From a paper:
DExD/H-box RNA helicases, from virus and bacteria to eukaryotes, play important roles in processes including ribosome biogenesis, RNA processing and folding, ribonucleoprotein (RNP) remodeling, RNA nuclear export, the regulation of RNA translation and transcription, and nonsense-mediated RNA decay. DExD/H-box proteins often contain accessory regulatory domains and localization modules, but their cores consist of two RecA-like domains joined by a short flexible linker. The N-terminal domain is commonly referred to as conserved domain-1, or [name]-domain, and the C-terminal domain as conserved domain-2, or helicase domain. Both domains contribute to the binding site for RNA substrates and both contribute to ATP hydrolysis. We used X-ray crystallography to determine the structures of the [name]-domains of DDX2A, DDX2B, DDX5, DDX10, DDX18, DDX20, DDX47, [name], and DDX53, as well as the helicase domains of DDX25 and DDX41.
[name] ([name]) is required for the release of snR30 (small nucleolar RNA-30) from pre-ribosomes. snR30 is one of three snoRNAs that are critical for pre-rRNA processing in yeast. [name] ATPase activity is important for optimal pre-ribosomal RNA processing, but not essential for release of snR30. In the crystal complexes with either ADP or AMP the loop closes up, resulting in a shift in Cα-atom positions by up to 3.5 Å between the ATP- and the AMP-states, or by up to 2.5 Å between the ADP- and the AMP-state. Thus the conformation of the P-loop is determined by the nucleotide phosphates, and longer phosphate tails result in a more open loop.
Residue numbers in the entry: 137 to 327, 330 to 378
The structure:
Amino acid sequence: SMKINFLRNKHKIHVQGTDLPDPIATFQQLDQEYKINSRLLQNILDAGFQMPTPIQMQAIPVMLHGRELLASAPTGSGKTLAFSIPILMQLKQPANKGFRALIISPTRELASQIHRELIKISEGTGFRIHMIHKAAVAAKKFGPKSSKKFDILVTTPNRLIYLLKQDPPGIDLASVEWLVVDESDKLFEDGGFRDQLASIFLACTSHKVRRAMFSATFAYDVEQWCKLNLDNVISVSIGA
Ligand SMILES: Nc1ncnc2c1ncn2[C@@H]1O[C@H](COP(=O)(O)OP(=O)(O)O)[C@@H](O)[C@H]1O
Ligand SMILES: [Mg+2]
């Protein structure tokens, strides 16, 4: 209460929305409150991430509570772990259900960095995290008629749309529980993208699907797009 008010005031966590989950002060809370995988928590601490960052403090519990999210914080804020931890925690265990989470980033470069961070923080947990490259697309390695032993996909909008539009579809999004857009401000400014995201979401038919939009800057048509498209959105923004 005073603790919570302190967290938000000290770390400049500005939050709008209804029924807001409290921020977490420490990664240790997550063992106490959500019973996070012990290896995952040790990986996080071994990486030297002693304390969550302001965006992590509030974004993580928002996603854990199944609430759609618009999260804004400058470059360097730790937005990758802010969405990766709750995705890993929600998914619980590797499974043979095909991709259960999908992260969209503007470029191969930025996608590859998210992919490596996921690989590193999830070491020893057995989660299979993939990018789908040209030859894998050619091979239909992640097709609906494949093994389905893959958990999390990191990708770009065009690559994902290419897969969806193949005949027959080179990917099935029916089990995706989390759809995360990273660098939303950039994406809504480059393309267009709005229609892609509509068709992506339309393909994500799980009763469980939730969306989170991450952006570097708290920007107008991302804000208005979210208030308009997301369900009961919670906005979190870190002041400078
Ligand atoms: N809790 C944390 N403590 C210390 N460093 C962190 C923490 N979370 C993330 N980082 C580091 O902060 C740097 C930037 O993280 P990143 O996800 O790229 O930020 P963003 O996407 O907001 O620009 C990375 O080197 C990452 O390892
Ligand atoms: Mg980033």
